[PDB]
Design a protein around this ligand. Structure first.
Ligand SMILES: C[S@@+](CC[C@H](N)C(=O)[O-])C[C@H]1O[C@@H](n2cnc3c(N)ncnc32)[C@H](O)[C@@H]1O
Length: 181
């Protein structure tokens, strides 16, 4: 059971791409209500439920309150784009780095379609710009984005900074792996 149907999208992405595994430290951006965080805790063994496997770590961040989850730490309210938020992230992550950065952040909808899409792409870019401080070299970045003209900039930057960038469909996700960075 999950706090949101979003879980199922992350479960499917991980099934194919194998981005979550025991021991990995995960940062989950736009984590409320916490379904991606629930998946992440299970797959990286953050609650230690499996004694036979490394114990990962999960930190979720959102503007909105997140109810406690066994095996995750949450920072809320916290704006992922606020410089204070990165420092708080660095203070909490084991070894001051994450192995996987997940992002399901989206602006609140306005009914202006280009504007909402562009704002989404902008969030992804701001997060990528703070990734050098947070993301383990070799690590993974998965973000919700929109697929079009304004997205090409984000896709180019990911291509420069990761060995491999996949576009994943049925909303669009970029999955960038093997951070140089
Ligand atoms: C679709 S929900 C995420 C659902 C989550 N992945 C889950 O599985 O429960 C999008 C979230 O992005 C958050 N968000 C939007 N902009 C943000 C920002 N600048 N910093 C932190 N969170 C943000 C929103 O508050 C909202 O909760």
């Amino acid at each position: 059971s999950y706090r949101s149907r979003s879980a199922f999208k992350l479960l499917e992405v991980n099934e194919r791409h194998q981005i979550l595994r025991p021991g990995l430290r995960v940062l989950d951006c736009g984590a409320a209500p916490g379904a991606w965080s629930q998946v992440a805790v299970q797959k990286v063994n953050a609650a230690g439920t499996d004694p036979s496997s490394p114990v990962g770590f999960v930190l979720g961040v959102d503007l909105l309150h997140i109810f406690p989850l066994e095996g995750a730490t949450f920072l809320c309210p916290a704006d992922v784009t606020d410089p204070r938020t990165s420092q708080r992230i660095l203070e909490v992550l084991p070894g001051r780095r994450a192995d996987v950065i997940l992002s399901d952040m989206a602006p609140n909808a306005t009914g202006f379609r280009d504007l909402d899409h562009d704002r989404l792409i902008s969030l992804c870019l701001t997060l990528l710009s703070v990734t050098p401080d947070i993301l383990q070299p070799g690590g993974t970045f998965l973000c919700k984005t929109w697929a079009g003209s304004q997205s090409r900039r984000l896709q180019r930057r990911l291509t420069e900074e990761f060995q491999n960038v996949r576009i994943i469909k049925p909303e669009v996700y970029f999955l960038a792996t093997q951070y140089h960075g």
